[PDB]
Amino acid sequence: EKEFEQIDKSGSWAAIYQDIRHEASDFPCRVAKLPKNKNRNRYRDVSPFDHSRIKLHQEDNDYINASLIKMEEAQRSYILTQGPLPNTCGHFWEMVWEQKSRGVVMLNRVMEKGSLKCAQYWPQKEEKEMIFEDTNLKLTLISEDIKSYYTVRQLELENLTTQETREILHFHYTTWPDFGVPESPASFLNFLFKVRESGSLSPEHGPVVVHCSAGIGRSGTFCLADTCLLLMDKRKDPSSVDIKKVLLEMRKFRMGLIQTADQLRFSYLAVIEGAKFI
Ligand SMILES: Cc1ccc(C)n1-c1ccc(O)cc1C(=O)O
Numbered sequence: 001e002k003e004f005e006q007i008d009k010s011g012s013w014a015a016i017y018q019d020i021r022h023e024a025s026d027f028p029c030r031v032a033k034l035p036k037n038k039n040r041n042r043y044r045d046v047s048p049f050d051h052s053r054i055k056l057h058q059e060d061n062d063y064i065n066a067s068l069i070k071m072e073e074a075q076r077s078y079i080l081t082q083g084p085l086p087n088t089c090g091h092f093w094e095m096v097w098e099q100k101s102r103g104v105v106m107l108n109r110v111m112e113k114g115s116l117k118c119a120q121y122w123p124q125k126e127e128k129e130m131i132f133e134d135t136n137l138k139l140t141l142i143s144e145d146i147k148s149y150y151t152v153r154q155l156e157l158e159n160l161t162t163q164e165t166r167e168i169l170h171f172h173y174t175t176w177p178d179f180g181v182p183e184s185p186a187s188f189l190n191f192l193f194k195v196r197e198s199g200s201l202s203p204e205h206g207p208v209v210v211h212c213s214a215g216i217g218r219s220g221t222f223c224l225a226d227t228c229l230l231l232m233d234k235r236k237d238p239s240s241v242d243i244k245k246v247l248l249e250m251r252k253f254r255m256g257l258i259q260t261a262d263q264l265r266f267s268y269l270a271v272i273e274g275a276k277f278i
């Protein structure tokens with residue numbers, strides 16, 4: 001609150017953001033850069049660090065552009081990944097299956113600014129299921145709840161090899177503007193609360209899988225707000241929760257979390273407003 005007003009009045013958002021970017025950790029991404037993985041990486045997207053990458057349980061190629069963000073004190077984990085490519089939808093759902101995730105959080109529309117941001121990786125009609133032959137998975141739309149700011153879908157994922165099925169919840173925030181950030185964090189906070197209310201972020205399940213469009217953040221704002229709000233509830237002194245410190249901690253696991261000074265300001269606003277509600 002006080003820190004927000006001081007930065008806002010002095011026009012220091014870009015300076016604070018540049019300092020975070022300059023202090024952000026840099027770890028190798030050697031596996032991501034291997035020639036055989038060139039078509040598994042979305043152009044203009046970041047690469048996962050070797051130390052925190054999620055490995056597919058496959059003998060030939062274990063690579064997927066996804067990272068595990070593990071927040072020790074908050075007891076929260078998140079898998080941050082790129083929006084699936086036309087050839088990586090099978091890998092994406094293999095990761096959801098292997099990591100025992102209950103929720104997938106999508107913070108972009110399939111088309112934004114007249115360009116495709118990710119493959120249509122889930123079925124749009126109940127009777128038209130998707131089959132991922134490469135990873136032997138079937139995915140069916142069970143139900144859809146379309147709201148004004150976001151849509152929730154219940155999906156059924158089937159391992160065709162064993163016929164075992166799992167219910168996956170798809171939380172799709174459909175109203176993040178093509179340019180900049182939302183004017184108010186209210187709908188984004190309601191979306192985060194809806195994800196929380198589903199059990200998708202809880203330790204009884206594998207990490208939630210979060211993604212957006214290449215190189216333009218968003219995913220970081222979701223995880224950063226969730227972890228900050230949880231720490232404010234857990235700590236004896238909620239005012240000791242430093243969002244810049246939490247962000248730098250998350251940045252140890254995946255690069256590029258919070259891609260603009262506007263997203264940093266938006267993250268502060270979502271945490272301040274969310275703490276007032278909680
Ligand atoms: C109850 C329902 C009908 C259709 C869906 C997709 N649902 C959900 C199922 C689980 C969940 O956590 C949220 C929702 C919802 O729409 O709020």
Ligand SMILES: [Mg+2]
Pocket residue numbers: 125126
């Ligand atoms: Mg129909």
